[PDB]
Amino acid sequence: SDEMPSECISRRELEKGRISREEMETLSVFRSYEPGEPNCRIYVKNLAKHVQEKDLKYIFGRYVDFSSETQRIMFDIRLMKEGRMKGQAFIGLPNEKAAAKALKEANGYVLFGKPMVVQFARSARPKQDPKEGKRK
Secondary structure (H helix, E strand, C coil): CCCCCCCCCCCCHHCCCCCCCCCCCCHHHHHHCCCCCCCCEEEEECCCCCCHHHHHHHHHHHHHCCCCCCHCCCEEEEEEEECCCEEEEEEEEHHHHHHHHHHHCCCCECCCCCCCCEEEHHHHHHCCCCCCCCCC
């Protein structure tokens, strides 16, 4: 592989920017939004103006084994840079377990001072759900 930089976020750094349900059902940024549902895709609100989709790779690509093509092939990020939906993002992950983990760890993350609102993907129109890449 020769794609993305050879550093992604450590759990001890990610865990500094995180909330419980006890703050979540208190925060105005969480007023209608809840984690933990089964989906291989996740999406985020309240990203910084200070950031691009090419930077969100640093955290969200932590859950993708980049030495294996079958993982990173199913991974990509777009950030909504402007309009009435500015500072929103979509991320497909290689597994619904990787999304379950990443929702438990990324949710509340204080990127550029701003607490990111990490959720299961709200709607998308594929034909079929994915599977495990190694021998399934």
